[PDB]
Amino acid sequence: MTEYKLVVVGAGGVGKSALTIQLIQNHFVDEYDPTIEDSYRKQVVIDGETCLLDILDTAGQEEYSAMRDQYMRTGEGFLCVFAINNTKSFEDIHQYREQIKRVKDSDDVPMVLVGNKCDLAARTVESRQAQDLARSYGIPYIETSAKTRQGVEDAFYTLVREIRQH
Ligand SMILES: Nc1nc2c(ncn2[C@@H]2O[C@H](COP(=O)(O)OP(=O)(O)NP(=O)(O)O)[C@@H](O)[C@H]2O)c(=O)[nH]1
Ligand SMILES: [Ca+2]
Ligand SMILES: [Mg+2]
Ligand SMILES: [Mg+2]
Ligand code: NA
C-alpha cells in the first residue's frame, strides 16, 4: 500500500498538534503542551486507495529550528499552518516555505496552506489575504478548526491529493 509522509509545520501555538490528534485520535486537545517532534501513523482509504499516512508533528518554538532541515528532507508533503487570530503566525509562513524550497531544491513541493482556529471570532487574517498568498505559491488554502473538526480531514486529504499530482 502507498505510504504518504506528511509534515505539519508552523509557528508555536497555531494548533498543529490539535489538528493532527483530531485526525488520528478523534478528540480535541484543550491544553497546550509544546511539541518537540512526534510521529503518528494511520491507515485510511482515500478515493478508493488504501494508504498509510505517516505524519510528523513538529515544533513551532524557534528553539528547535535546528531540526527543520532534517524533516524537510524526508517529508513528501507539508501542511503549513497559521492561526486566523495571530497575524504574526501568518507572516511567519513565508519563512517555512522558503526553507522547504531550499532544502528540496524545488519550486513545486506539495503543500497546503491551513488557516486554523476558525471557530474563534478574533480574526486578524482575512480569508482573502491567505487565498492571495496560497495563489502565489500555487497551492490550496483551507480553513480549519481542530476544536469543531471543521476542515480537518479535508486539509490532510487535500494534501494527499496534491502529492498525487506530483
Ligand atoms: N479554539 C481553538 N483552539 C485551538 C485550535 N487548535 C488548537 N487550539 C488550542 O491552541 C493551543 C495550542 O494548540 P497546539 O495544537 O498545542 O499548538 P501547536 O501548534 O502544536 N504548538 P507547538 O508548536 O508549541 O507544538 C491549545 O490550547 C489548543 O487547545 C482551534 O482550532 N480552535
Ligand atoms: Ca479534550
Ligand atoms: Mg504541538
Ligand atoms: Mg488587516
Ligand atoms: Na524555516
Author numbering: 1 to 166
What does the paper say about this structure?
Consider, for example, the Ras proteins, which are prototypical members of a superfamily of membrane-associated small G-proteins that control an extraordinary range of cellular processes. Ras proteins cycle between an active GTP-bound state that transduces signals by binding to effector proteins, and an inactive GDP-bound state that cannot bind to effectors. The switch between the GDP- and GTP-bound states is accompanied by correlated conformational changes distributed throughout the structure of Ras.
We determined the structure of wild-type Ras•GTP and the L120A variant at room temperature, both crystallized with the same crystallographic lattice, and found that wild-type Ras•GTP is in the R state, whereas the L120A mutant is in the T state (there is evidence in the electron density for a minor population of the R state, with an occupancy of 20% or less). Helix α3 and the C-terminal helix of Switch II shift downwards in the transition from the R state to the T state, leading to a rotation of Tyr 71 from a buried to an exposed conformation. In the crystal structure of Ras•GTP, Switch II is positioned such that the sidechain of Gln 61 is not far from the catalytically important conformation that is stabilized by the binding of the GAP.
